[PDB]
Homo-oligomer: A and B are copies of this chain.
Amino acid sequence: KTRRAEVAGGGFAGLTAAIALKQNGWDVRLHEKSSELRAFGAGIYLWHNGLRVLEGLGALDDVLQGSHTPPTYETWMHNKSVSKETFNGLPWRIMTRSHLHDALVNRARALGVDISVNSEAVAADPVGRLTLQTGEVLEADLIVGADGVGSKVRDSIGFKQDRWVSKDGLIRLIVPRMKKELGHGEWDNTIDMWNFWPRVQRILYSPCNENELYLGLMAPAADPRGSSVPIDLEVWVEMFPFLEPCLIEAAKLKTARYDKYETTKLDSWTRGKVALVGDAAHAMCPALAQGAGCAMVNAFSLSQDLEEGSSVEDALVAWETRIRPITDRCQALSGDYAANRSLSKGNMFTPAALEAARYDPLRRVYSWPQ
A78 partner, pick from B69, B77, B89, B92, beta carbons under 8 A: B77
Q: How far is the CA of A184 from the CA of B71 in the complex (A)?
A: 20
- Residues of chain B with a CB closer than 8 A to A211's CB: none
Chain A, range 14-67, C-beta contacts under 8 Å to B: 60-61, 64-65
Say yes or no: B88 contacts A91, CB within 8 Å.
Answer: no
- Residues of chain B with a CB closer than 8 A to A79's CB: 78, 80
| Count of identical protomers in the assembly | 4
Residue count of chain A within 8 Å CB distance of chain B: 28
- Residues of chain B with a CB closer than 8 A to A60's CB: 367
Judge whether A84 is part of the interface by a CB distance below 8 angstroms: yes
- Residues of chain B with a CB closer than 8 A to A88's CB: 68-69
A197 partner, pick from B65, B93, B196, beta carbons under 8 A: B196
- Residues of chain B with a CB closer than 8 A to A337's CB: none
Say yes or no: B184 contacts A65, CB within 8 Å.
Answer: no
- Residues of chain B with a CB closer than 8 A to A197's CB: 78, 196-197
- Residues of chain B with a CB closer than 8 A to A106's CB: none
Judge whether A72 is part of the interface by a CB distance below 8 angstroms: yes
Chain A, range 60-118, C-beta contacts under 8 Å to B: 60-61, 64-65, 68-69, 71-72, 77-80, 84, 86, 88-89, 91-93
Which A residues lie at the B interface, using CB under 8 A? 60-61, 64-65, 68-69, 71-72, 77-80, 84, 86, 88-89, 91-93, 183-184, 196-198, 365, 367-369
With contacts A65-B369, A71-B72 known, what are 13 further pairs, Cβ within 8 A? Answer: A61-B367, A64-B89, A64-B367, A68-B88, A69-B88, A69-B89, A71-B86, A78-B80, A78-B197, A80-B80, A89-B93, A196-B197, A196-B198
